[PDB]
Amino acid sequence: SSRPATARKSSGLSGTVRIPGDKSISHRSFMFGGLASGETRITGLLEGEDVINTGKAMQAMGARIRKEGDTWIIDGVGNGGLLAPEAPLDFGNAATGCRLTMGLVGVYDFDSTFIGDASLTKRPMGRVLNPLREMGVQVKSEDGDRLPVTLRGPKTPTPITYRVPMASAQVKSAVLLAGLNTPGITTVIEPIMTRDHTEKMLQGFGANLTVETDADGVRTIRLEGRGKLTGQVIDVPGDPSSTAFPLVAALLVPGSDVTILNVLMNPTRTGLILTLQEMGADIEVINPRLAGGEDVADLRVRSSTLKGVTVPEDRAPSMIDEYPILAVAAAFAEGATVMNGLEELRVKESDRLSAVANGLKLNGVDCDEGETSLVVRGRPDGKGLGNASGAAVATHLDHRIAMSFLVMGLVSENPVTVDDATMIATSFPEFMDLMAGLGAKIELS
Ligand SMILES: O=C(O)C1=C[C@@H](OP(=O)(O)O)[C@@H](O)[C@H](O)C1
């Protein structure tokens, strides 16, 4: 069921720790490794529940996946070699696995059914199902294009040129993956850049995929379908979204000095760091280097005094999953922090804009929730913040709401309680141990 947890005011956080692997790249490592010809070897894989579910779905379609020592080894089926699954593919809490797999297997001439948990089942799939319908896929979904969904691909899919209407890397990714089993050229036009793990990894696996960027920033991504993919050696970098939690905690808890190692620094993932630096954060980027084909660095974070800033709508895609923890940082900053262009937060694991605003208010923070924006006014000394009565923040099955508010409790005058910590393991099973090791006081009921 649910397992509440309470975070208490802590003394300085201190230590050096390696952050778990990147979730986005980990999902794709299992997917591309399972699809490619031959063997793929992965080190640094995130072993959270979301990623394990993607792995099980790939096994259900013929990939052999196993862990030898600290390396995941995958024997792929080759492009065009996916086998019809016997039962529904259960993605649990993971929209990434679900949406990308819809594109990947929806274009195959067999039935595939997709199911998930109470959170995933409420999220919109129309954004990926519409382009698939244009490609010839037959779709059976629940009202509003929600799970459960059953797809059946045509004998020969139709390649399309699709302009993504919202800044979603998952929609871009689903169309490109569908293009892998479609004859001809599939083109995705992305007006605003989103995380590019699919493009970079498919090129690494040998796909004839090109990316052209116009001077105005619009990206035209072309993929030639039904081409060979070759197994690769993958070294997964640390998750910058998971890094955000100990990083913001170190900035807010006085007397802190925390170094996080091997953090992915791809600019489509670092909007929070840029934003915190503008607010006055002391974050040092150490030994920037190339590892596994990606930019990584170690980050040394020290306690800082923060000031509110205006966060523009165009930075949102580069930090979309970090708005919950940014809002918590803003609760302790001098002045107002204003964030717009947040419509996408309403369709995540939880409606994050509503969950964050309600959680902040429950914990004494002055904030204003707009249809697509949030304004937060802070109290630097944390006085009056938190909830002395022990009232619990509603997490709405969202791991990031649970983690963000637990970070808040390490700083607020009064403890912060979340109604459930059980979903944290979907993306960061190491969270409790990692934070405790740094000195955080978090009591699990
Ligand atoms: O492709 C990916 O790995 C992801 C893209 C984002 O979703 P959207 O495409 O809906 O923005 C992000 O919020 C999600 O956690 C993972």
What whole-number distance in Å separates Cα of residue 158 and Cα of residue 155?
10
Tokens of 422: 């059980």
Q: Is the shortest distance between the CB of 169 and ligand 1 below 6 Å? A: yes
What whole-number distance in Å separates Cα of residue 25 and Cα of residue 23?
6
Tell me the β-bridge partners of 211.
221
Domain boundaries, the chain: 1-22+237-445, 23-236
Q: Which residues are catalytic?
A: 321
- Cα–ligand 1 centroid distance for 94 (angstroms): 10
Give the end-to-end CA distance of the chain in Å, rounded to a whole number. 12
Pocket test for ligand 1, best of 320, 348, 399, 403 (most atoms within 8 A of CB): 320
Which residue type does 139 have?
V
Peptide bond into 20 cis (omega under 30): no
SS3 of the chain: the string is CCCCEEEECCCCCEEEEECCECHHHHHHHHHHHHHCEEEEEEECCCCCHHHHHHHHHHHHCCCEEEEECCEEEEEEECCCCCCCCCCCEECCCCHHHHHHHHHHHHCCCCEEEEECCCCHHHCCCHHHHHHHHHCCCEEEEECCCEEEEEEECCCCCCCCEEECCCCCHHHHHHHHHHHCCCCCEEEEEECCCCCCHHHHHHHHCCCCEEEEECCCCCEEEEEECCCCCECCEEECCECHHHHHHHHHHHHHCCCCEEEEEEEECCCCCCHHHHHHHHCCCEEEEEEEEEECCEEEEEEEEECCCCECCEECHHHHHHHHHHHHHHHHHHCCCECEEEECCCHHHHHCCCCHHHHHHHHHHHCCCEEEECCCCEEEECCCCCCCCCCCCCCEECCCCCHHHHHHHHHHHCCCCCCEEECCCCCHHHCCCCHHHHHHHHCCEEEEC
What whole-number distance in Å separates Cα of residue 247 and Cα of residue 65?
33
What whole-number distance in Å separates Cα of residue 204 and Cα of residue 201?
5
Which residue type does 52 have?
I
How many residues in total does the chain contain? 445
**Burial class of 143 by CB neighbour count within 10 A (0 to 12, 13 to 18, 19+):** exposed
Nearest to 94 by CA among 116, 76, 75: 116
CATH 3.50.50.60 fits 1-22+237-445, yes or no: no
- Cα–ligand 1 centroid distance for 96 (angstroms): 6
C-alpha 262 chain-centroid distance: 17
**Burial class of 124 by CB neighbour count within 10 A (0 to 12, 13 to 18, 19+):** middle
Contact between 48 and 427 (Cβ < 8 Å): yes
- Cα–ligand 1 centroid distance for 425 (angstroms): 18
Tell me the β-bridge partners of 339.
311, 374
Of ligand 1's atoms, which has the minimum distance to the CA of residue 23?
Answer: 3
What whole-number distance in Å separates Cα of residue 82 and Cα of residue 35?
7
Contact partners, residue 69, CB within 8 Å, separation at least 6: none
Domains 1-22+237-445 and 23-236 share a fold: yes
**Burial class of 118 by CB neighbour count within 10 A (0 to 12, 13 to 18, 19+):** exposed
Print burial letters for 281-300: b (CB count within 10 Å at least 16), e (below 16): bbbeeeeeeeebebbbbbbb
Beta strand pairing call for 64-68 and 71-77? antiparallel
What whole-number distance in Å separates Cα of residue 175 and Cα of residue 18?
34
Query: Which one is the CATH code of 23-236: 3.40.50.1820, 3.40.47.10, 3.65.10.10, 1.10.287.470?
Result: 3.65.10.10
Of ligand 1's atoms, which has the minimum distance to the CA of residue 100?
Answer: 1
Which residue type does 76 have?
G
- Cα–ligand 1 centroid distance for 380 (angstroms): 32
Cβ count near 217 (within 10 Å): 11
Which residue type does 305 have?
T
Nearest CA to ligand 1 atom 12: 321
Of ligand 1's atoms, which has the minimum distance to the CA of residue 167?
Answer: 11
Nearest to 385 by CA among 368, 355, 405: 405
Beta strand pairing call for 294-302 and 257-264? antiparallel
Rg of the chain on CA atoms, in Å: 21
Contact between 132 and 125 (Cβ < 8 Å): no
Q: Is the shortest distance between the CB of 173 and ligand 1 below 6 Å? A: yes
Q: Is the shortest distance between the CB of 320 and ligand 1 below 6 Å? A: yes
User: What determination technique applies here?
Assistant: X-ray
